[PDB]
Design a protein around this ligand. Structure first.
Ligand code: CLA
Ligand code: CLA
Ligand code: CLA
Ligand code: CLA
Ligand code: CLA
Ligand code: CLA
Ligand code: CLA
Ligand SMILES: CCCCCCCCCCCCCCCC(=O)OC[C@H](CO[C@@H]1O[C@H](CS(=O)(=O)O)[C@@H](O)[C@H](O)[C@H]1O)OC(=O)CCCCCCCCCCCCCCC
Ligand SMILES: CCCCCCCCCCCCCCCC(=O)OC[C@H](COP(=O)(O)OC[C@@H](O)CO)OC(=O)CCCCCCCCCCCCCCC
Ligand SMILES: CC1=C(/C=C/C(C)=C/C=C/C(C)=C/C=C/C=C(C)/C=C/C=C(C)/C=C/C2=C(C)C(=O)CCC2(C)C)C(C)(C)CCC1
Ligand SMILES: CC1=C(C/C=C(\C)CCC[C@H](C)CCC[C@H](C)CCCC(C)C)C(=O)c2ccccc2C1=O
Ligand code: SF4
Lengths: 41, 80, 31, 74, 94, 143, 165, 64, 75, 35
């Protein structure tokens, strides 16, 4: 699975998974914390 | 009527001469490089200006420099 | 009170004169 | 997107290569130069990107126009 | 040419080998009948010189200006006809 | 010493059906080039003007509008057929000028006895600045 | 009132905008039955809209001529009037997070530059090394300031290529 | 005696017109026949043409 | 002559070793991405099977399997 | 507007006469060979 994990470590797979997890994290942030116009603490 | 010049960084690999489609460049004997040959341009009146010699020069920076200048019926590559 | 015919004709003649001046300057510049 | 195509369609590779050289100087100053050398898009690359963006932008503009107009009135 | 076989080049006959041909031009004296040829060469006699055929263009331009002087109005044309009231505009203007 | 070969005018031409990319009005009043080569068999080659032609056994004679077309045909003969050839420059007044294999051997191989003109003894960056040659009608690299 | 702006808690046009949005959503409501899935979706949308408007009135945003929140992008003008969360606090947040990402990428570049094949390591990313450097990049400001004071963050101009003027 | 930098050493290019100006290069060979550019320098960084080696003279190359 | 089914038993092994190395299909993409032009050419020549192999048989097999993959995408 | 006839003469002059003469003159001069 060394070659398979090397394929998973290739630049397109890693950038698509990274933008996927970042977009999903931001989406769930807006799902639980919607309409956050300002950083009101 | 294009100005083609050869400079001493030429290593005599003959690639500029082979790349020329109108036979402008040729190899003359020389003593400044290992190959003992340098390029020369005796027939610049047949030069169209395609710069294929520059695309073939491996020296950095290139030794066969083409300066586009006056245009004639042969520099413009016209068949009419 | 709009201008008269003679004023227009005199202006056009003076423009012809300055056109002669202009072509003189152009010929001098070409030489 | 259609007007973004106009960058690639009207410009040429040498300008972008020299600008990339200046940006590479900026990266060298901060030791953040990639080992894979950044090059400007090739001439055929630039033409392909320009025509792809042009057709995408025009077709999508017409698609949005047609669908909005025909779904709002009919 | 000397194209009796497959020889399409000849330095002694370089006229035909280059491709200079008449295509359709043929030499013949007979074409136009009598009296009318003299009539037409008299009609276009002194006009053959470059200066007088230039003067024909000069009188043509004189006709161009004569249309503007008196000729545009003879075929009516709206640019020299009369006018019918006017319009005020968006606000109180004229 | 080397002597240029004469252009044998009565030389057979390759079999060809007639193209539209051949000679035009430039040949009559400026110049048309011509290429001559020796073929060892009857075989089909590609014309620089488009289409396929059959060159015949022995001498083959082909006239072309430009020198670049002649060199394209010569280089495809040299690569796909291993056949050398001679190119000539033919003026309409009658004078014929020998061209590409000028000193016998090909220009990519040294001959010891050529003119080494247009060969500067400096680097690219050793040319003069354009301000130092201002109002001269020459580029900095031809000083 | 920092620049002729009124707070959205007391500005009338903010309440008018909220009322208009809720009324439009109620007009959308008045077509389905009470317990349908579209009815629940519209009720959730209404609740989200009212919560958003009440939160914007609560947080102390400034409204202009009409009821739209305005942000202040001046330190001091936003600090002493209590609107540092408009621009200043998100400025600090972005600077921190962008520095984290950029420092992680930089350290990956300098880590793989001194390997056998730095060319291969940039298309084939060493995932454990990237994960470790992404974790280490959370202390990017202190590391960057330390490397700047050490002089190892910047490169000497005599070792950097330029054009021949 | 041998001339130029020793083979395999680390050198910096002083030719301001070259691609690798003030960069890192390794000497591959130095010709002793009298070549105008006898030093052969190989670079890990390729140029626009795609080559990674070039010939340089004596005064445009300093070691380390 | 004589239309019939002819195939080759197990020509290409099924594993992930060429997935690790992009640009394997063409010789000009070997020895790593020295520039980003390599990255662009890798996608540019992915389906140019003429530049990958000179054999018409391998090109035809690649075309057939690409058709099957496209049919799977459409399905 | 005084002298209404004058535009009717001048506009064709600078639209037809002067432009045709100028274009013909410049076409003659650009291929004069031996000026
Ligand atoms: C650079 C321009 C820019 C800026 C400054 C903003 C800023 C903002 N947008 Mg916006 N947006 C933009 C461009 C921009 N956007 C573009 C181009 C689009 C079109 C795609 C959108 C579409 C959009 C929508 C649809 C919405 C926003 C929303 C928001 C607000 C939500 C803040 C938040 O997510 O909570 C805080 C987030 C965090 C604390 C996470 C930070 C840490 C993460 C995990 C790090 C990520 C690593 C990379 C915020 C003020 C939302 C909103 O409600 O507006 C008020 C919302 O609904 N944006
Ligand atoms: C709408 C048309 C358009 C647009 C958007 C641009 C945009 C840009 N030009 Mg440009 N230009 C144009 C027309 C345009 N130009 C035309 C017609 C010409 C004449 C040929 C020029 C000539 C020109 C020159 C000579 C130069 C520029 C430069 C620039 C850049 C300036 C930096 C900047 O402002 O960052 C803004 C960034 C953007 C506007 C990009 C949009 C942001 C994207 C969409 C975010 C990505 C999101 C998403 C991932 C998108 C991908 C989707 C996909 C994956 C599905 C910028 C990207 C200069 C430059 O390079 O700067 C260093 C430069 O020197 N332009
Ligand atoms: C980005 C540039 C910038 C600009 C254009 C301004 C502009 C302004 N600032 Mg400000 N400031 C800035 C950066 C900036 N600041 C930064 C980075 C900080 C953090 C150190 C501060 C901290 C700050 C404070 C604490 C205050 C201002 C204040 C002000 C306002 C009054 C200044 C004055 O009295 O006359 C000009 C002053 C000169 C010395 C000239 C003014 C509109 C004052 C304010 O809030 O206005 C009521 C105020 O007290 N600023
Ligand atoms: C992490 C890598 C990295 C780093 C540290 C930098 C840093 C810098 N860039 Mg650069 N850049 C990068 C990647 C990077 N860039 C990439 C991939 C591109 C191609 C899209 C560019 C294109 C680019 C241009 C055109 C310019 C800069 C400029 C600059 C400088 C101005 C600050 C800035 O943020 O500009 C903006 C940076 C961007 C718009 C690109 C950001 C792209 C992403 C977010 C970075 C890559 C993330 C990386 C994959 C993370 C790896 C994690 C690791 C653990 C594996 C700055 C020193 C400017 C400059 O020269 O200033 C003087 C400038 O003109 N960059
Ligand atoms: C049955 C359809 C078909 C097939 C099998 C092929 C097959 C082939 N074509 Mg071809 N072509 C087709 C239709 C087809 N084409 C059509 C309809 C057009 C007109 C647009 C072209 C125009 C064309 C050109 C100009 C070229 C080819 C080339 C090629 C060869 C190499 C392709 C390659 O790997 O490049 C790479 C393929 C890609 C990088 C895929 C991406 C292409 C674009 C960017 C996708 C479009 C974006 C898409 C709509 C998504 C937009 C949304 C976005 C926001 C995410 C290959 C044998 C190339 C060649 O050299 O021939 C030997 C060549 O240059 N084709
Ligand atoms: C450069 C200034 C200028 C311009 C742009 C125009 C433009 C125009 N004029 Mg006018 N004119 C001008 C100066 C100018 N005039 C001056 C100074 C006078 C006083 C003698 C007149 C007297 C005049 C009359 C009596 C009439 C016009 C009319 C007109 C209109 C049709 C042209 C025509 O038929 O008349 C021909 C114009 C002339 C014979 C004189 C113009 C000479 C100018 C100064 C030449 C300038 C050339 C410029 C500097 C360089 C351009 C290169 C060029 C030489 C090729 C036209 C819109 C007609 C009209 O009213 O239309 C309804 C009309 O009958 N003009
Ligand atoms: C810039 C100056 C200019 C001027 C002053 C005119 C003037 C005129 N144009 Mg013209 N045109 C112009 C520019 C101009 N055009 C340009 C730039 C174009 C290309 C876009 C055209 C294309 C155009 C078309 C397609 C047509 C005109 C026509 C006309 C005539 C309008 C109909 C009429 O008056 O009845 C008749 C005009 C006359 C009787 C005067 C001409 C002949 C007089 C009697 C002198 C002849 C001398 C000879 C020896 C007898 C008019 C004389 C229309 C026309 O009538 O065709 C000629 C028409 O079909 N024009
Ligand atoms: C505003 C500017 C006006 C300028 C006008 C210039 C006109 C040209 C000019 O004067 O030419 C001067 C020449 C005199 O040349 C010379 O004419 C001389 C005779 S004499 O001097 O005129 O007596 C003669 O001896 C000499 O050989 C000859 O060169 O005159 C001509 O020969 C013009 C004759 C034109 C005959 C045909 C006219 C068009 C026919 C229309 C057919 C259809 C009709 C419906
Ligand atoms: C710095 C000193 C500024 C304090 C001025 C106090 C003004 C009134 C106090 C006041 O306005 O209320 C507290 C204020 C922010 O609180 P908010 O008004 O946003 O609280 C209300 C909403 O958040 C809850 O609905 O905090 C600040 O003053 C700025 C925060 C410090 C900035 C931290 C950055 C550190 C670097
Ligand atoms: C007597 C008279 C008559 C003739 C009247 C005529 C005939 C009037 C003509 C008027 C005209 C037609 C005037 C035109 C003037 C043109 C001018 C003023 C142009 C000036 C150009 C300038 C200043 C710039 C020139 C430029 C310069 C600087 C260069 O050197 C080159 C570029 C260029 C831009 C050209 C008739 C018989 C009717 C009735 C009887 C009385
Ligand atoms: C802008 C531009 C460039 C510069 C373009 C570059 C450097 C390419 C930039 C790509 C960056 C590095 C990637 C950006 C990634 C985006 C977030 C999404 C891109 C879409 C992909 C998924 C395909 C040229 O090289 C060029 C060449 C010839 C004619 C015109 C032009 C031209 O207009
Ligand atoms: S290609 Fe360059 S180095 Fe080679 S012979 Fe020609 S000029 Fe000299």
């Amino acid at each position: 699975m060394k070659d398979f994990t090397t394929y998973l470590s290739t630049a397109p797979v890693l950038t698509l998974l990274s933008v996927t997890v970042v977009a999903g994290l931001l989406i769930e942030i807006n799902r639980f914390f919607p309409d956050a116009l300002i950083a009101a603490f | 009527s294009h100005t083609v010049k050869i400079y001493d960084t030429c290593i005599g690999c003959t690639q500029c001469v082979r790349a020329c489609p109108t036979d402008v460049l040729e190899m003359v004997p020389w003593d400044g490089c290992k190959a003992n040959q340098i390029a020369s341009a005796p027939r610049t009146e047949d030069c169209v200006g395609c710069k294929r010699c520059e695309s073939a020069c491996p020296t950095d920076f290139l030794s066969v420099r083409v300066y586009l200048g006056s245009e004639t019926t042969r520099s413009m590559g016209l068949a009419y | 009170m709009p201008i008269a015919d003679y004023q227009v004709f005199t202006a056009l003649f003076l423009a012809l004169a300055t056109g002669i001046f202009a072509v003189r300057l152009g010929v001098a510049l070409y030489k | 997107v259609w007007a973004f195509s106009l960058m690639f369609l009207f410009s040429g590779r040498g300008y972008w290569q020299e600008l990339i050289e200046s940006i590479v100087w900026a990266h060298n100053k901060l030791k953040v130069a990639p080992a894979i050398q950044p090059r400007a898009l090739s001439i055929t690359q630039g033409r392909a990107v320009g025509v792809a963006h042009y057709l995408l932008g025009g077709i999508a503009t017409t698609w949005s126009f047609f669908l909005a107009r025909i779904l709002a009135v009919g | 040419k000397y194209g009796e076989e497959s020889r399409y080049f000849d330095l002694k006959d370089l006229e035909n080998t280059v491709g200079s041909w008449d295509m359709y031009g043929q030499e013949d004296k007979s074409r136009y009948n009598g009296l009318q040829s003299e009539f037409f060469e008299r009609a276009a006699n002194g006009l053959s010189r470059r200066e007088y055929i230039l003067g024909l263009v000069a009188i043509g331009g004189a006709g161009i200006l004569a249309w503007g002087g008196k000729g545009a109005a003879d075929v009516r044309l709206p640019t020299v006809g009369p006018q019918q009231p006017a319009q005020v505009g968006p606000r109180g203007r004229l | 010493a080397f002597t240029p070969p004469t252009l044998q005018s009565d030389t057979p031409s390759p079999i060809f059906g007639g193209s539209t990319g051949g000679l035009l009005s430039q040949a009559q009043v400026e110049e048309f080039h011509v290429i001559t080569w020796e073929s060892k068999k009857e075989q089909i080659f590609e014309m620089p003007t488009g289409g396929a032609a059959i060159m015949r056994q022995g001498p083959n004679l082909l006239k072309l509008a430009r020198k670049e077309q002649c060199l394209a045909l010569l280089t495809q003969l040299r690569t796909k057929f291993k056949i050398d050839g001679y190119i000539y420059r033919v003026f309409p007044n009658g004078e014929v000028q020998y061209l590409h294999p000028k000193d016998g051997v090909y220009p990519e191989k040294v001959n010891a006895g050529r003119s080494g003109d247009n060969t500067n003894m400096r680097r690219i960056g050793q040319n003069k600045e354009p301000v130092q040659i201002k109002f001269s009608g020459k580029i900095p690299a031809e000083f | 009132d920092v620049a002729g702006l009124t707070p959205c808690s007391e500005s009338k046009a903010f309440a008018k905008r909220k009322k208009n949005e809720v009324k439009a959503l109620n007009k959308r409501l008045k077509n389905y039955e009470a317990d349908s899935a579209p009815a629940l979706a519209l009720k959730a949308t209404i609740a989200r809209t009212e919560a958003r408007f009440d939160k914007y009135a609560k947080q102390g945003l400034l409204c202009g001529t009409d009821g739209l929140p305005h942000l202040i992008a001046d330190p001091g003008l936003a600090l002493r009037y209590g609107h540092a969360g408009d621009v200043f606090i998100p400025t600090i947040g972005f600077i921190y997070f962008a520095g984290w990402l950029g420092y992680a990428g930089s350290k990956y570049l300098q880590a793989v530059a001194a390997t056998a094949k730095p060319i291969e390591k940039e298309i084939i990313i060493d995932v454990p090394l990237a994960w470790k450097l992404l974790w280490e990049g959370f202390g990017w400001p202190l590391r960057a300031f330390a490397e700047y004071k050490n002089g190892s963050l910047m490169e000497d101009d005599a070792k950097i290529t330029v054009s021949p003027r | 005696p041998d001339v130029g930098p020793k083979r395999g050493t680390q050198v910096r290019i002083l030719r301001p017109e070259s691609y690798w100006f003030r960069e890192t290069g390794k000497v591959v060979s130095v010709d002793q026949s009298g070549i105008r550019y006898p030093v052969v320098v190989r670079f890990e960084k390729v140029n626009y043409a795609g080559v990674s080696t070039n010939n340089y003279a004596l005064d445009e190359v300093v070691a380390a | 002559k004589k239309v019939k089914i002819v195939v080759d038993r197990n020509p290409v092994a099924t594993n992930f070793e060429k997935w690790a190395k992009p640009g394997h299909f063409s010789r000009t993409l070997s020895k790593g991405p020295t520039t980003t032009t390599w990255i662009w050419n890798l996608h540019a020549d992915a389906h140019d099977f003429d530049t990958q192999t000179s054999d018409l048989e391998e090109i035809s097999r690649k075309v057939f399997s690409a058709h099957f993959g496209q049919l799977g995408i459409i399905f | 507007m005084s002298a209404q006839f004058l535009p009717s003469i001048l506009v064709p002059l600078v639209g037809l006469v002067f432009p045709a003469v100028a274009m013909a003159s410049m076409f003659l001069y650009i291929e004069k060979e031996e000026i």
